[PDB]
């Protein structure tokens, strides 16, 4: 018995929003330690959905005064008097023993943890948690490994498990190795898979794309636009494209007709967010209706791939993050698409790298226009670069079917433009932009007029 409700609604990785909760009550408790146990939370909303959350458990009979307040969670009588509930996953030693299940790839009455074979889990380091983390809780054991442990819980298979493990025992050396995971069922034994957590290689000493492509577009008097970042989206390009080779290998590909139903709905729900797109409507769909009975190539992908998700060592580019198409239903982000929407969610991150400096300057800093010249400039490079890179491994250039790619640019691109309305106007011209842009671009492929 505890004040679960009371506690997690103050919660950074809490999804209930504005609503107001019936009850939150454990469903499954399972005791890990004579002090710890595993908790799958219910948390019952008035509409009569149900969202369940994973907590683990840390009991003391004296307050300790490592944990802090968010760590917390109440206070509960027990067979040797009073004892307080703290976040396990703050505890070194309880984080320690989730890594050293997982390396045993123990059985624990319906928790199943497995080790990746071949894998060493790094038992001795020091764990800290994550404050990046944000929905889930990441402890980092020393420079070696990281374990994610989920904390709103759903059914089905994990994208980012399931496509890490692919990559990893195919030997691809573009991701951040899976070492282990573990899991649960839904509603006892013999029912659905849950995923409850995943144990990854930590990269030390890596940079995120997302600041190295910053750094690069904001260099002063960078009129000439320079070869080293070049290199480096020639490299990702590079990365990209053995990931997707390898997993059309493992998980296959088929033909589906391009979806121009789909990026329609999505196009009218956005001019209804940006009322500056319905000038552009008619022409954007005019290109989407122009690929109707277009046979595409299918295969699972990343899904939600832009610079933040991919880190540079100081050997390889690697791609992490495959749970997929934000704010979309499992189902839907494990469906298979078109490789060339990936490369165009990488040539929308390199827009938004260069174009981030000219949103934030004063008119008069860029009164004739140079900047934008310079950004307009190191976009085209680098996105030749990357889409050379990936056309080195690939054997075939993203860039040959054109009207397709440019395609799935425009419809990230509208999107964004609905994204910066509602939530940044002062960014609503970049995407807005490179609507102008890209259908040039798209009716240029159309009529087979791209180089
Ligand atoms: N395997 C890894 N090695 C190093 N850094 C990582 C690794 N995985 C994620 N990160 C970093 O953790 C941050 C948060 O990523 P998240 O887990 O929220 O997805 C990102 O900024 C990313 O750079
Ligand atoms: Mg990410």
Same mark, same amino acid.
Request: hydrophobic share 40%; glycine share 8%; net charge negative.
């Given at each position: ?5 009371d506690?997690?609604?103050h919660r950074?990785?809490?999804?209930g ?6 009850? @939150? ?7 890990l330690?004579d002090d710890?146990?595993?908790?799958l939370?219910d948390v019952? =909303?008035?509409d ?17 005064a490592? %944990?802090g307040?968010?760590?917390? /969670? ?6 040797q008097?009073?004892?307080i509930?703290?976040? @396990?996953?703050?505890?070194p030693?309880?984080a320690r023993?989730?890594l050293?299940?997982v ?5 624990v @009455?319906?928790?199943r ?8 889990? !790094?038992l001795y380091a !020091?764990?800290?948690?994550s404050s990046?983390?944000?929905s889930?809780?990441?402890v980092?054991?020393?420079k070696?490994?990281?374990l ?9 298979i994990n994208?980012?498990?399931?496509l890490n493990r692919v990559?990893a ?6 991701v951040?190795?899976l070492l282990?995971s573990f899991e ?5 034994p013999?029912?659905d ?8 290689a930590?990269?030390?000493?890596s ?5 190295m492509?910053?750094?690069? @577009?904001?260099?002063?008097?960078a009129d000439?636009?320079?070869?080293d970042?070049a290199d480096?989206? =020639?490299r ?9 080779a390898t997993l059309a ?9 391009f !979806? ?8 009218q729900s956005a ?10 409507a008619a022409?954007?769909e005019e290109?989407?209706?122009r690929?109707?009975?277009?046979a /595409?190539?299918?295969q ?5 791939l832009?610079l ?9 580019w690697?791609?992490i993050?495959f749970?997929?198409?934000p704010?979309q239903p499992?189902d839907?982000?494990?469906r298979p698409?078109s !490789?060339?929407?990936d490369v165009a969610g990488?040539?929308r991150? %390199?827009?938004?790298?260069? =174009? ?6 004063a008119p008069?800093q860029?009164?004739?226009g ?8 190191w976009?085209?490079r680098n996105?030749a670069?990357?889409?050379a890179?990936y056309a ?6 993203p860039?040959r ?7 799935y ?6 999107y964004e433009a609905? =994204? ?7 960014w609503?011209p970049?995407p807005?932009?490179? /609507?102008?842009r ?6 240029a492929?159309?009529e087979?007029?791209?180089?």
């Open positions: 018995t505890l004040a679960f409700g506690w997690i609604v950074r990785w809490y999804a929003r504005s609503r107001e909760l019936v009850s @939150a009550e454990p469903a499954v408790v399972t005791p330690r710890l146990d595993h908790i939370l019952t =909303y008035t009569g959905t149900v969202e369940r959350y994973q907590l683990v458990v840390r009991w003391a009979d004296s307050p300790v490592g %944990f307040e968010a760590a917390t /969670i109440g206070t509960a009588l027990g067979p008097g009073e004892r509930a703290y976040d @396990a996953l703050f505890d030693d309880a023993h989730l050293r299940l390396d045993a790839s123990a059985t @009455a319906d928790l943890f497995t080790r990746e074979p071949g894998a060493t889990l !790094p !020091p764990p800290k948690v990046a983390e944000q889930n809780t990441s980092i054991f020393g070696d490994a990281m994610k442990v989920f904390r709103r819980v759903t059914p089905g994208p980012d498990i399931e990559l025992q195919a030997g691809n050396r573009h951040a190795r282990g649960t069922s839904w509603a006892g013999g029912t898979r849950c995923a409850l957590g995943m144990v990854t930590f990269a030390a000493n940079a995120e794309g997302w600041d492509a910053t750094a690069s @577009a904001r260099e002063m008097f000439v636009v320079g070869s970042f480096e989206s =020639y990702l390009g590079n990365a990209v494209a053995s990931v997707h290998e493992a998980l296959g590909t088929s033909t589906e007709p !979806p121009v139903d789909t990026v329609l709905a999505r196009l001019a209804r967010s940006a009322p500056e797109l319905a000038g552009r022409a954007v290109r989407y209706r690929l109707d009975g277009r /595409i190539t299918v699972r992908v990343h899904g939600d832009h933040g998700q991919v880190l540079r060592t100081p050997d390889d690697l791609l993050d749970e997929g198409e704010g499992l839907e982000r494990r698409d !490789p060339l929407r990488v040539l991150s %390199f827009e938004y790298a260069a =174009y981030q400096k000219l949103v934030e300057l008069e860029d009164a004739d140079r900047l934008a010249d310079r950004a307009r400039n976009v085209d996105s670069a990357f889409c890179g080195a491994v690939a054997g075939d250039d860039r079917d054109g009207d397709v790619l440019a395609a640019e425009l419809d990230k691109a509208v609905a =994204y910066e309305a509602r939530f940044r106007p002062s609503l970049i807005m932009r490179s /609507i102008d890209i259908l040039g671009k798209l009716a492929a159309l087979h007029h791209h180089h």
